[PDB]
Amino acid sequence: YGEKSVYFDLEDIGNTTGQWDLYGSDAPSPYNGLQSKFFNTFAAPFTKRGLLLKFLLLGGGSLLAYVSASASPDLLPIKKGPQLPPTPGPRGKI
Amino acid sequence: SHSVKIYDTCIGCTQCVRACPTDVLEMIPWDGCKAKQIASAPRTEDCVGCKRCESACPTDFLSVRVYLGPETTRSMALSY
Amino acid sequence: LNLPSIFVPLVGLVFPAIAMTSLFLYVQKNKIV
Amino acid sequence: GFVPPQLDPSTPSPIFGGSTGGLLRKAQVEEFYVITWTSPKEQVFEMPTGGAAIMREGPNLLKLARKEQCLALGNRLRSKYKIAYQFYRVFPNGEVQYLHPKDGVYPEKVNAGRQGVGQNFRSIGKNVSPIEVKFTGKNTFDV
Amino acid sequence: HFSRTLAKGPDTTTWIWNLHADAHDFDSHTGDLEEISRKVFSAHFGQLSIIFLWLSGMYFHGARFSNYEAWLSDPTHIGPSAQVVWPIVGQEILNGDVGGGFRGIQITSGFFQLWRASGITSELQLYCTAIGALIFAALMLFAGWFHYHKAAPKLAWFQDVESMLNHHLAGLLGLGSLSWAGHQIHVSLPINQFLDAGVDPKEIPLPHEFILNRDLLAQLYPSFAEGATPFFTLNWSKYAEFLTFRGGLDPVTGGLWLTDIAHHHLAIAILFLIAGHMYRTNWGIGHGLKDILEAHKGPFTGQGHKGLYEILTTSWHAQLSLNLAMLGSTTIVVAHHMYSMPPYPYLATDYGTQLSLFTHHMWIGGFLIVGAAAHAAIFMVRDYDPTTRYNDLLDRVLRHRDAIISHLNWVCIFLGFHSFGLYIHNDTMSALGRPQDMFSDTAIQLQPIFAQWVQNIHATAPGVTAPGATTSTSLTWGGGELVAVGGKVALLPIPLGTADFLVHHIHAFTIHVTVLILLKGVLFARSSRLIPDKANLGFRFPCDGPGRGGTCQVSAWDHVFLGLFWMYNAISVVIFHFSWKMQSDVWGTISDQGMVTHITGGNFAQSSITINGWLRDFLWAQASQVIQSYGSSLSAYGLFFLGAHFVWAFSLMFLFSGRGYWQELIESIVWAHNKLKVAPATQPRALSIIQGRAVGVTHYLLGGIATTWAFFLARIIAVG
Amino acid sequence: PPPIGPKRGTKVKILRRESYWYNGTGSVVTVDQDPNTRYPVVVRFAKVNYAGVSTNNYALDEIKEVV
Amino acid sequence: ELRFPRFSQGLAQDPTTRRIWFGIATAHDFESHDDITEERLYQNIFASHFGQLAIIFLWTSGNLFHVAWQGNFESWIQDPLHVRPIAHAIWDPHFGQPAVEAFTRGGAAGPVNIAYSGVYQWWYTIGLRTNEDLYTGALFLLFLSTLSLVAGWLHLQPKWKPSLSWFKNAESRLNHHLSGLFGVSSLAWTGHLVHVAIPASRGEYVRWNNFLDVLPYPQGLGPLLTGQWNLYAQNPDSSNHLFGTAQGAGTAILTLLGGFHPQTQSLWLTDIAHHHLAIAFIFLIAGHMYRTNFGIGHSIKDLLEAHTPPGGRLGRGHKGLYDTINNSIHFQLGLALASLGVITSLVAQHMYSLPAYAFIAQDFTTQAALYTHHQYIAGFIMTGAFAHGAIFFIRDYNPEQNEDNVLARMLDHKEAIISHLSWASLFLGFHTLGLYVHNDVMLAFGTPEKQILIEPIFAQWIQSAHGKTTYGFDILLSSTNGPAFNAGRSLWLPGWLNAVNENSNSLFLTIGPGDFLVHHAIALGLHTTTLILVKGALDARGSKLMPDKKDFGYSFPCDGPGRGGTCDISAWDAFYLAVFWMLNTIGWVTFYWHWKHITLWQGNVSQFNESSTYLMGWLRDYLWLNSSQLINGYNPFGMNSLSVWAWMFLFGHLVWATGFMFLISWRGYWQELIETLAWAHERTPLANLIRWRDKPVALSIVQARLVGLAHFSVGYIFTYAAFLIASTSGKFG
Amino acid sequence: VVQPINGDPFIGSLETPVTSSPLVAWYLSNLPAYRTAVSPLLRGIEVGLAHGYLLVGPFALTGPLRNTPVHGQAGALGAIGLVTILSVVLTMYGVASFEDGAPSTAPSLTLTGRKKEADKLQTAEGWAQFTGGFFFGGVSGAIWAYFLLYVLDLPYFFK
């Protein structure tokens, strides 16, 4: 592959089909050691996907429900309720 | 894959074979007509279902029939 | 306790989220027998 | 009989500037196709993916994403020019399947040795009603 | 054409349709470029003859069945009328009281203003013009016969583009502009000055007297007393009386100053005379178009523009596509500039004429642009040949068509969201009782600051960047000046707010989508990933079968089919915007104390930011005139309104269905006719797929456009 | 041996259900004498079918002689 | 059974997004599933039916519970003509304060919706009085829904799965459903009316805790046993009776009065009880016709084989029809759908003219809503009947077993049937449209006296024969002396004649030329829709263009561009085309009903009578005139309680327009665009790390037709619902 | 300056200044997503920090409570809610796309053809670690932006 205008090679299909890494970098970690140690320690319990999905869904639903049920009336008009006498209906309807 | 069938009213004119865009059909020897040949469909895994072959057939009713079936990457003509 | 303030978010937001997640995971499975 | 030709991987490709209509991830993961031919001289032709290319004198090898593209280009080569061609299917593991022309003779020309597939020896009006194949898993045309 | 079309399909009715569909597709009849060119030349002469006949009709109807003479004496309180109907089955109710002791149909073509600007004062002059136009139509017909059946030119004559450009630039446009400037200086200017001085039209001197008596013309402009001496002595300032650079509008007639127009046409004539000496024909001086094109290379490897001369010299369709695009764009620009800077006297206060002219020329421009797309696609299918006529730039475009189309698709989606979703946001907020959360002037503001900056620059231009101009080019820019004629507003500064921002981005969205459809049709006319050999199927074919998932409407013709709908959508929104904005903020009546009352009282700013506002305050409110017209002179508009709704509804039967159903039904109907022995000699067939699409789109566009036509005319005649 | 099928120019009625000219009338052009030919009778019709063809091949038991 | 959908390996192996869409679309077509058998088909259908019953019970339980919890049923009972019933409360956090103020109605403490389904009047008429009754009903219906789910699970297990022979027992099912499902249910409802609802209409509160200690009649069962049945009718409620009270109350429980209750403007409950008693006994008699296992009864097969004319033009008659019906489920579904659609239209026609619920005639919005709702449902059911008939012809019909019977002959002369339907449609369309256009031209030229105004004299004669005296005719029941008049002179004439001669109601409304024109328009719609559906059904097996259509199934895209082109050639496509005509016909019907009634209710019938004879009259005086209050639901100056209906009006217009995109543009354009999008995604940095697992493709041809039709229908329904409700309720509440 | 990608004319891509400029290559290679040899958790931390920090502004300044003395808290809470939704969707994509124990699906070739270690991001465990880092960083960045804007009250052009 890549010799005398040849782009096909059965011994290297990855090159022939263009399965490259255009921008991937092989450089080592640029982050400081202590910073990485702190983040590895404190972000560990969130790295389990099966537990994370259930935790996110349940906790988020609970938090949303709690926020909705505890909203101040001055912030949410639907909580404040009507403040004016009702408008009359047509032909005497109430 | 789609299904393609040839019926014995074929007159062996070869037009359906020429019309196919994916080389599904071919001609084989026969003794049932004056032309002494009949169409065949050995490569239906490459058939896309365009029905050009039916458009090319001169008999009434048709001697080549295409029945659309389960869809695949080849039948849907996907290049990605 | 205002029941609508709790139930409307659950039926409009949380339950659709759970149902859509479960249906997506069910239709993405490569092996269901 | 007929011995299918072997695919030579050291065959040059036509001179082309590139385009956005070439191969995609399907060639990497599923399959692609290769068409080869021999040209008497160097000359301009139309790519099936858009744009124009220059075919070299001698052997030419071209990579494409679908069999339909290969057959369209081959028909153009046979009709406009007078060039014999053949194309193959290539799999990600490297195995090669020779495709066309299948037995060295074009399908539209009758040739001995071909076995019939999908032939019903009756007129099309003799197919049964669907009720006769209900719950049986067959087709009224599958005989 | 008739013989071959009949021989193709003699046994079925289909051939009949083909006979009409392929009448003028000359390239399909023969492959010889010379014969095609000769046919095109003769057909062009035929079109010119038809146009001359139409002009003759207009002038004759103005001379015989019009109140032009009465209107000339009182333009403000008399409505133009040039069509009268016979008293049959009660249709004489259409002869309404237009004014000046005349009953007829009021016209909105603006011919009275044009004739007044030309200086025509009597019916005899209109008769003479009609007779001359008839003579010219006959001459065009004879020339069309002669240059095809007797004296057809050769192919090398047609391919002389240098000479054609020189003659058409210096002879057609330059000399035409100069001769019209002569007419305006010597005929239209004094006649219009006398008319503006309140002189009886039958007492105004005849135009030729102004040529045979210098003393008569010197009383209006003293410079004419010196004759042609200042011109030869280069003391041109003496002609400053009738060659001005004022700007603005004439306060008496509401149009542009005629002296400005004469000076403009003189300058244009000089410019085109200079431009017409660029290309080399026979004397070894001038440029070569091929050399100019081949001299523009680029850093992107080889030179790109090389080879375009051969393509544009050997393909009629490429020339037609490019010329259609340019001419359509010119028509749209004409509409804008004619509304904003009214060139005819008493045109600005004739609201019906202004609305009609703007809308009509917008429609013409849109149709022409779509035609440009269609013939570009036809060139791609039929004349493109890289092995014989190669061009680099076209090849590169074809090699990144995918990137082009993907970027255009994204920009269309972005524009659609961030423009129409703002209207939807406004509707939702208003319905929810939250007006403080809307996108409006009294809420979250989206000001078109760049347009306002341009308006301010053009309003403050006189005296700084254009010292020689008395006022700005238009009263729309600003300056705080209002021009009123006969108690009606002609023009005044046009404010721009949040609603204008929203609607302009609507226009951008619709235009980008129409471009997406047409350009996709062009760039994939020959092939695609789905259909590798689409060029062999042709320009106009219904599909390539139900395979590959289904391939309906892949041809470039079907792209033109869809682009027509999107063009209709875009232009309809444009003309609705114009109508509502002009009625709300410009047109109106001014009292003796300077109080301005607009037709709809300035409701555009607050009502046009929601879809419900357009539904209620534009459609529902302004349809009152058309739906209440029965029993009056405008009842024909109500009848046409209903009929156009009917035609539009009828088109959906063709657009929604398919031909297999109709052929199967025709089978039973044919059985019924056979049983009674009344069978037709020609076998009936259902319309082809392509013909079904064509019929559907034609009746859809006709119904919609005619509906809007009746609505606009009824509203503006009854209220403006 | 005598030739099989009707003579040239004979008027026949079509009995094939899926034929465009079913229960119609055609004229015999020629009959193939090869015993292996499954549809030897060539029939021509006045009206073309949906595909533009006006001739077809039929078996002996798919046609009926009419006068 | 590898991945979704599990019931189809052809779809499960599909690598595109199509696999998902069709997976949803084919889920309930059991006959097409892999390795399906007849017994499994019947069992799955049984379980699905139990599911449908469970859903229905849950729906009605929810309605009852929300009315009890958030409604004002008790206040509405006290003031029926002035209190607006409440459907349910509103809790929407997107609301602004003005919306909260505007939607607070009916005495509630917060924003609510006003009910238009008529449940208040219905439940009040059948004896419900308090919130506790509604709560008990809701709980009982919830229990019934749970029981339905349990039974659906139970009859699917191996122990309790019925066999095919049980499912194919027609005689026993017919006997049980006639005697038990209809007769016994009607008898039980008569018992409810006598024991509970009628006492409730007189101030007597009878519940489960005292119904054994309260006599429905003062003399109990004495008159029934002694044979003096007339004693159950001698003291009916007087003309000054107040419905909820004992003032003027009688004691009769079965009568033959006729006419309307003067206060509630609805039918007497006593007449309803007697009617249901008679119907119950008629069905009980009818339910003993067929032999199951006791040696007495008729055989359906024998009856079908017997009816064969000796020399008439019918061939073998009804021979073999029993097997065809009993072996084809699609035939049974077609017959059932046809009957149910007819019944739905009859219900719509009779409930507006002969109301049975107290105070519902005065609730104009409810009347209009109910009529429009049930007529649209009936139209959809009518289309479905013919769809499943065509399906029967494709999948189940066997010519050999149906030789020379009625089905074979119907297939044999399909051309004549189609030709005659086509002629009828052409005649109706030509002459009706011509009359309308002639009248429009006469109005345009200012000569309204030259209109062609044809009186509907046959319908006027029928109205006169039923007792109406508006037109001055002297046909039966309107003349002083007559045999038919004298026979029923004392039976029911005193009430019926008074009812028909009071024009305040909707009983035999006065009609004129506009009624004639619009009725012939409705006839055109019926005949043309029938033409489309019948042509689809009879050509479903094949035609000259496609003689082998039965081998391709009920629904397929086309047969390609050959033979001249074959778009929309399948029977499914005929159903698709017929839905548009059904919508158009029902639109005409409901426009007519609503305009006539809205002009009657305002006291301005001259408006309809004068404007309905030309089309501009319909456009201006019905649509444009009645849209003003609706379109002012919100505007730059504020909003009111109609804002939701204005928003829904615009929403319907938008969905209707969106359907046009799918209907007009077709697939190949979109597929070509999607390929470009796929390239773009694969080439974009930071986004090509994300990969689709189902390859994106454009929607299929048939899928596009279905989606476009769905958007069209939803937009149609929502737009007209918004207009109807807003226009009626803005004027009347 | 426009060439076929990596010199192959028949791969469906092109090299342009937009795609192949050395500055563009350096910038893209120094982003967290393309640090193929670094731990997925830390790259997820960086991505989450950035996006959670940037999400505060729109919610705080455009929301329904923008004209209320609690607008900053509302904006921060909205940003946290959006971060939670995005984390759920990331977990869904990871569960659907990657089996447990399957090898990495990332390319193992450089532009010059040199073989490399496949990126561990394209695995079940790697994607889960990246998602956990993203959630933690998003919450932390939202809190940090809120602290800078509405606790210290630093001078900003609009707040």
Ligand code: SF4
């Ligand atoms: S349908 Fe198209 S691809 Fe299939 S056999 Fe016929 S011509 Fe070939």
Ligand code: SF4
């Ligand atoms: S529906 Fe019509 S246009 Fe579409 S593939 Fe079928 S025949 Fe062609």
